[PDB]
Design a protein around this ligand. Sequence first.
Ligand SMILES: C[C@@H](Oc1cc(-c2cnn(C3CCNCC3)c2)cnc1N)c1c(Cl)ccc(F)c1Cl
Length: 293
Amino acid sequence: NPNYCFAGKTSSISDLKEVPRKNITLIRGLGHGGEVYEGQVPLQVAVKTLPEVYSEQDELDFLMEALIISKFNHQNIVRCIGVSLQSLPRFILLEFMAGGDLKSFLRETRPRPSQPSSLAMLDLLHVARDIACGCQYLEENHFIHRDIAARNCLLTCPGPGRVAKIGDFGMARDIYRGGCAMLPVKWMPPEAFMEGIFTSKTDTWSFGVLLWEIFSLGYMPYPSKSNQEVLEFVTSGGRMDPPKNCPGPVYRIMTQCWQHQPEDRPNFAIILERIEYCTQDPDVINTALPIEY
Ligand SMILES: C[C@@H](Oc1cc(-c2cnn(C3CCNCC3)c2)cnc1N)c1c(Cl)ccc(F)c1Cl
């Protein structure tokens, strides 16, 4: 079995905490991709399954992801409860995030003529703060996520106490051990998609796009552009306009995240400071979010 190194320590799949199959119950499907369920171990879990029809490479990839997540220790990264590997299909057990993924949440929770104050600017800033905090943790432990995006973030619950966490590490796992049309190029900086260069400044760019996802309330980035057009657009200096009703201080963070040169972009410590200043500015957090009719 493969070895993984994070922080100063080196681990092995054998080190994954095994949960006996008999203690695990599958309650319902959670919209599968492999399949994902809500489960109980009483501990409420999310269960990620490895399809049995998959081969050998996928099997190691699958466990590698549990190993990667298991070695993190931070409040804004989803916890791995353990694995169940001594029965088919293979299970990975994760902290259950009742709020679901961030993109769906945003789309489904957009203020309406009936619920105009469902979400406010401060809620968005706190989600952005949560994830920036997870990213800072990754950056200072020299881990590059490579796929920061709303679809890969989770919320603890729907309501006001919600905490956002980074949840999917499949891209990081892949590069660790494939096609053009499966690369998240709309979240990637030029040096990333042109040269395959990835640094912590790679994630800073992606976080800027996520910001935009957050303050658009779940729109797909670069609306009405294809990947190839975005690639040519961004390479040419093109950048997205502000989401609707987006305060200038928030947009300004996005545009700094999208500086063409990696060394001109902020590290996550700087992004956090700037996000916190936004939570202090009444002209930011008193701004009304748009309503779709
Ligand atoms: C692997 C899977 O794990 C979870 C899914 C979910 C989830 C998905 N959907 N829902 C809904 C359950 C019913 N109520 C609304 C949310 C919960 C919660 N916690 C998880 N750890 C997952 C998914 Cl499906 C999507 C994005 C992610 F970043 C992750 Cl990490």
